[PDB]
Swiss-Prot record:
Its main location: secreted. Synthesized in the acinar cells of the pancreas. Its EC number is 3.4.21.4. Belongs to the peptidase S1 family. GO terms for molecular function: endopeptidase activity; metal ion binding; serine-type endopeptidase activity; serpin family protein binding. This is Serine protease 1. It comes from the Eukaryota. It is an enzyme of class 3 (hydrolase). The keyword Protease applies. It comes from Bos taurus.
């Protein structure tokens, strides 16, 4: 997260870290057994880490649970990043408490102009590289679809939305991939892609979770 702020320990209790020997992506806990992340975060041997603040120090509130299965969206296209969503099932149910909690799926799509909370342990520089210890947060508005399409001509599908600041300076970044965009207490987006980070006229592009609720519900009812 570039140009954001330190969230505060366990104030984003649905935020997870995906670990494969190292942190590589974020995710969102949607119930005791399932995490929503980006399909571009897919790999084998994922361990889900819940209740994290400092990802490099065991502070006492963590739950580390291996993934039992990963389910990439059936229409995910890794070239265009259309349908950039994946479900990850935990080998055992997480213990839900104040520091580990699920985030609601949306019943309707979010509105242009709505300020959302984006979070992660990704790069904090728009140029150069610095990775934070503790979880970072960013408040950013959903942009109009016309401004989104103008920023990325020929690249924005109906399964994507833009959020952030056209002036640049504030954005999600590498390492935040798969993490939450929460608007009005609902998981509305997943950190997907963008040209660089915090670049002028290049806002963040996010998977439009409201389009996937049926698929999510069907998949979790059957796996
Ligand atoms: N909001 C952005 N500008 C943005 C969002 C997501 C990415 C994803 N990078 O994937 C590689 C990785 O995470 O290691 C890049 C830029
Ligand atoms: Ca920790």
């Amino acid at each position: 997260i570039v140009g954001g702020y330190t969230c505060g320990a366990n104030t984003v209790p649905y935020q997870v870290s995906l670990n494969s020997g190292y942190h590589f992506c974020g995710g969102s806990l949607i119930n005791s057994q399932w995490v929503v992340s980006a399909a571009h975060c897919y790999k084998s041997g994922i361990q889900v880490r819940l209740g994290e603040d400092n990802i490099n120090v065991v502070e006492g509130n963590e739950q580390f649970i291996s993934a039992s299965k990963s389910i990439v969206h059936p229409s995910y296209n890794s070239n265009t990043l259309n349908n950039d969503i994946m479900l990850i099932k935990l080998k055992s149910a997480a213990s839900l408490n104040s520091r580990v909690a699920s985030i609601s799926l949306p019943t309707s799509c979010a509105s242009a102009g709505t300020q959302c909370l984006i979070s992660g342990w990704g790069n904090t520089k728009s140029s150069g590289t610095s990775y934070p210890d503790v979880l970072k947060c960013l408040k950013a508005p959903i942009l109009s679809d016309s401004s989104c399409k103008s920023a990325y001509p020929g690249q924005i599908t109906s399964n994507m939305f833009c959020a952030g600041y056209l002036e640049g300076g504030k954005d999600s970044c590498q390492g935040d991939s798969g993490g939450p965009v929460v608007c009005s207490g609902k998981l509305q987006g997943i950190v997907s892609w963008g040209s660089g980070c915090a670049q002028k006229n290049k806002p963040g592009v996010y998977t439009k979770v409201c389009n996937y609720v049926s698929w999510i519900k069907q998949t979790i009812a059957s796996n």
